[PDB]
Design a protein around this ligand. Structure first.
Ligand SMILES: O=c1[nH]c2nccn2c2nc[nH]c12
Ligand SMILES: O=c1[nH]c2nccn2c2nc[nH]c12
Lengths: 167, 167, 167
């Protein structure tokens, strides 16, 4: 039914190194900010843990175990707090972090919205079975990105992945 | 304590074919709508998934696997998002869907409010052990239905099933 | 990133026998009430279940199984509804109830804020490995209690236990 207050709490999973990825994430953020069903959005790369004992940290890049633990746990906490996952999913460069997180959320029985992106529509349209069956809602990033502004995250209606060859 | 905003998110479980069942559901919805502790109510039958490749689908009839998956997942998603379950539970015609959902929610450690209905109070008062022990709060549907309007769904105080013979 | 509404739902775990304990709980409650990230706070001892069939029940005495079940379940329900745990943790008299609840919440992947108190700073600073590693954020109760008023419970940033000997 119609929610009295917004209840949607989104875990936004995405790689964040290159341009386009960062641009995708930013646009996703604005779109979600326009959605009246959303109470909160968590994006892992926004904040960050600082290890006082960590000298000259990179990103390459050997990191302290304290930093690793704190950041990983910040992400798991984000998944725990979240009601649903929204993943900006690069089909050209598969991100195993995002896949890990999708599997994690599905094991918790939480709904997962997959938002796939490709710069090669001329190439074969294929998906790993675990992703294709694991995700509960697909919203195409190249053609339907704008739907993130209107999607009812209070209820997260299903939309099974179809039209992808499956391996 | 007193909630700053309503936090109650209800999964409302009930069969929805017959008259009476539908009436029960409607009254339940109104009562819950009057409750200030509730942020959201999900009722499985309100919306629906439409499989484009499904021609002339019948309730009770053979359904496509896509529709089955999407609908089942819509319910599981509702259970996931919910903080608690409220089941309009017909003691005269046992619904195994509702029982399934009760078990699912209890396995997730979520509280379950059972709202039993009978058209034969003069008849034997008996309940299956898994339901009687599984549910955390009982509110009699014939005599206490109205309590759905005032019950504090921010905290869901317990009220164990008593007065039922157990098999 | 920034919440549209507060989403923090706190399970406040603490013993409630001594005046010192009750005072800690009270101050904690007041501090949390000032936190704009918090939607709701649950404290187990605030309310109570009353077993009509229980004659002259005594705190610390033999309790009816109905009371035991209902009360235990009220706590588990509090943990279920909660997004995170905040534990007023007496390092001088270890409370196994609170520890139980911490383990329960961590098994559910929920974040746990430990707020340790000691009146014997002269003694060695030691912690059980399961508590030190189980907890996701430590806020010292003796020196940093007030931080409960400002902490962002929408996201619950990590802060690993350091400075304690580990046994
Ligand atoms: O720096 C990060 N690398 C990274 N790989 C996977 C998740 N994350 C993550 N979340 C927050 N910061 C980071
Ligand atoms: O609500 C309670 N929770 C709880 N955990 C451990 C003991 N207790 C306790 N004793 C009386 N009421 C309670």
């Amino acid at each position: 039914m119609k929610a009295v207050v917004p209840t949607g709490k989104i875990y936004l999973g995405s790689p964040f190194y290159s341009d386009a990825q960062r641009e995708r994430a930013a646009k996703a953020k604005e779109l979600l900010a326009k959605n009246p069903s959303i109470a909160h959005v968590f994006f892992p790369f926004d904040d960050g843990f600082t290890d006082p004992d960590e000298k000259n940290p990179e990103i390459g890049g050997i990191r302290s175990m304290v930093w690793r633990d704190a950041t990983y746990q910040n992400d798991l906490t984000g998944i725990s707090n979240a009601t649903c996952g929204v993943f900006l999913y690069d089909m050209d460069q598969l991100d195993d972090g995002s896949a890990f997180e999708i599997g994690f959320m599905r094991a918790m029985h939480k709904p997962v919205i997959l938002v796939p992106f490709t710069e090669h529509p001329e190439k074969e349209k294929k998906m790993n079975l675990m992703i294709a069956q694991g995700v509960t809602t697909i919203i195409d990033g190249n053609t339907e990105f704008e739907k993130l502004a209107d999607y009812n995250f209070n209820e997260c209606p299903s939309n099974p992945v179809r039209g992808y060859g499956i391996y």
